[PDB]
Amino acid sequence: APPGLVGALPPVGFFDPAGFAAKASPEELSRYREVEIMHGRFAQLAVLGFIIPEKCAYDGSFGDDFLAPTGRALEVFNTDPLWLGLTLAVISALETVRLIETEPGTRTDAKIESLGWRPKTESEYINYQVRELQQGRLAMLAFAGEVAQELVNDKPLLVNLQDSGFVSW
Amino acid sequence: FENELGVIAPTGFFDPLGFTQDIDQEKFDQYRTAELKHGRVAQLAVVGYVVPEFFRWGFDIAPGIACADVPNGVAAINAIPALGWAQIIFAIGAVDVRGWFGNFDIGKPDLKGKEEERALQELQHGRLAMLAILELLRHDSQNLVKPGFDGLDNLITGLPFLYN
Amino acid sequence: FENELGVIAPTGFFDPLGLSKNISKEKFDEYRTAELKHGRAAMLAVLGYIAPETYRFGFDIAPGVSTYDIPNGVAAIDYIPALGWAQIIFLIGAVDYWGVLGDFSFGKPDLGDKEEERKLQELQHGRLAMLAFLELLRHDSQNFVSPGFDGYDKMITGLPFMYG
Ligand code: CLA
Ligand SMILES: CC(=O)O[C@H]1CC(C)(C)C(=C=C/C(C)=C/C=C/C(C)=C/C=C/C=C(C)/C=C/C=C(\C)C(=O)C[C@@]23O[C@]2(C)C[C@@H](O)CC3(C)C)[C@](C)(O)C1
Ligand SMILES: CC1=C(C#C/C(C)=C/C=C/C(C)=C/C=C/C=C(C)/C=C/C=C(C)/C=C/[C@@]23O[C@]2(C)C[C@@H](O)CC3(C)C)C(C)(C)C[C@H](O)C1
């Protein structure tokens, strides 16, 4: 069914119930894959960002005002809004650098070849691409869930776990 | 080295961080020896954690002490005199390097046909036991440094029948 | 084997019990390796049984114990906790089997036209140091069991000026 995209794994297979990777063009599928990779990268970072500041609030490690009322990371919109604005601005600037340099079709290769490590063979690479994609998918789901849950009952993740009797700490 | 005992589903060849990239057969043989020995030790260690929870020997390790008073987990490395621990260590070493009270020919059965399958099974069990021994060590040591810190009481938390 | 290194004038070839007849050169290599290692360790012993009698380092070996109070000799063992002893034993082994922290090439000199004379000096010193350690252990242990035995209450009896 698929056209050679490195994705697709044993748990399910080629997951495409709605029929999008048959009604698209050769360039459209490339853009879809890029969209996937990028969303995942951001998400993964955002999940780690939700976890660590919130925990540092739970452990009294940043003072008694860090995420003041509850401890939710969605509370930065109340305490320090301009900091969040400037951070989104810096992200936007570096991503404008991306949009300028990278050309249509790439938009994912940061040319970070020597600055980091990489698998030496070729099969392992295919595996690492599949991994990046899978971690990104799981992170997308996790971020959506965290945001929805916190907007439902204003309460941090670890505390929502502690209450309601889902952990043992 | 993509075809050597240890390749089993789901993960075909689990060398993600490129360790078998540029190595000769000697180094991979050393790695396999370390893996097999580690696995065997881990399996014996897990069995050792479980069994003293419902049975203790009838002798008296160390001058006093007695085998039925010693704590069960990460402790008992500080409740047995150091000389006895050193002697046990060196005896295990004698069995390890010299291979002494550990090579009896009645210990190498004729695995008619099934040799490779049984080697693969032994390696996989070693892997599982290595992870299990890590979990047991973490739970015990953490709940020893600060009683609690996990909520889960008891040392072998998982088999509640032993009431421990 | 009556021409290999290790023959001096008092007792030229020492082998009364015939422990080196019919052996292959591989073994005699292993025997010489054991002799050299034991000799070096015995020298370091006969030097570590003396130094603490007038100079204790100062640090804390374990969380509560101080190397200012632990008695010297076959008594310090049961003071340092068994985990610390083990953590040492394994590091000494790391230096002994994998040859780490002990193979720095600038420690191996070029004895030139003396490499057959300094090796013999090393071996003979080791032979003497082994017997010295035997005597020190005898005195130490015999008095640690029954205090006052042999009458010479001190440790390094032969060096009275130290005030053992
Ligand atoms: C004096 C006794 C003695 C001797 C001479 C040997 C000899 C050997 N062992 Mg060995 N071993 C022993 C006791 C001994 N063992 C005991 C009691 C255990 C625990 C079951 C093991 C577990 C063991 C494993 C798992 C492996 C060896 C390996 C080896 C080989 C070389 C590596 C080595 O020892 O350097 C030691 C070098 C080190 C760097 C030591 C590592 C220290 C670890 C990481 C942390 C130490 C934790 C702490 C100090 C000990 C707590 C446990 C203790 C209280 C029981 C060699 C044949 C290795 C092998 O076959 O080839 C690779 C190997 O993989 N041994
Ligand atoms: C820099 C350079 O030069 O080279 C670089 C190149 C390159 C490639 C960048 C490099 C790399 C790789 C990197 C950085 C890889 C990073 C990968 C990363 C960071 C992957 C995160 C996954 C997180 C997940 C899946 C979250 C799960 C979370 C899940 C599934 C949850 O359930 C969360 C949860 O909330 C729910 C939803 C409900 C809550 O009630 C309960 C909890 C809280 C449990 C290197 C190695 O750095 C070198
Ligand atoms: C330093 C220190 C410690 C220590 C220690 C250590 C490691 C001490 C080590 C002691 C050690 C290593 C003692 C070896 C003796 C070997 C001997 C005597 C060999 C004799 C061999 C003899 C006498 C002769 C043999 C033969 O002549 C025969 C019989 C016939 C001939 O044909 C052949 C030859 C010539 C070979 C403690 C205790 C751990 C704690 C303390 O706090 C600090």
Author numbering:
A (entry chain 5): 37 to 205
B (entry chain 6): 36 to 199
C (entry chain 7): 23 to 186
Excerpt from the publication:
Based on the analysis of the FCP bands by mass spectrometry and specific sequences obtained via transcriptome sequencing of C. meneghiniana and genomic sequence of C. cryptica, we assigned three FCP sequences to the local map of FCPII-G/H1/H2 adjacent to CP47/D2/PsbX/PsbH as Cc-Lhcx6_1, Cm-Lhcf7 and Cc-Lhcf7-like protein, respectively. The B-C loop of FCPII-G is short and shifted towards its helix-A on the lumenal surface, leaving a large space to accommodate PsbX. We assigned 11 Chls a and 3 carotenoid sites in Cm-FCPII-G. One Dtx is identified at the 303 site of FCPII-G in the current structure, which shares the same location and orientation as Ddx303 in Cg-FCPII-D. Cm-FCPII-H1/H2 was identified as a heterodimer, despite of 80% sequence identity between them. The binding of the FCPII-H dimer to the PSII core is dominated by the association of FCPII-H1 with FCPII-G in their loop regions with help of several crucial residues and pigments. Four carotenoids are assigned in each of FCPII-H1 and FCPII-H2, they are Fx 301/302 and Ddx 303/305. Thus FCPII-G and FCPII-H are both inner FCP antennae strongly associated with the PSII core and probably mediate EET from outside FCPs, and may also play photoprotection roles through the Ddx-Dtx cycle under high light conditions.
Diatoms are dominant marine algae and contribute around a quarter of global primary productivity, the success of which is largely attributed to their photosynthetic capacity aided by specific fucoxanthin chlorophyll-binding proteins (FCPs) to enhance the blue-green light absorption under water. One of the important factors responsible for the powerful vitality of diatoms is their extraordinary light-harvesting capacity, which is achieved by their unique antenna system, fucoxanthin (Fx) chlorophyll (Chl) c binding proteins (FCPs). Here, we solved the structures of a PSII-FCPII supercomplex and a trimeric FCP from C. meneghiniana by single particle analysis using cryo-EM, which revealed detailed structures of monomeric, dimeric and trimeric FCPs, as well as their binding to the PSII core. In conclusion, the cryo-EM structures of PSII-FCPII and the trimeric FCP of C. meneghiniana provide detailed insights into the structures of various FCP antennae and the assembly of FCPs within the PSII supercomplex.
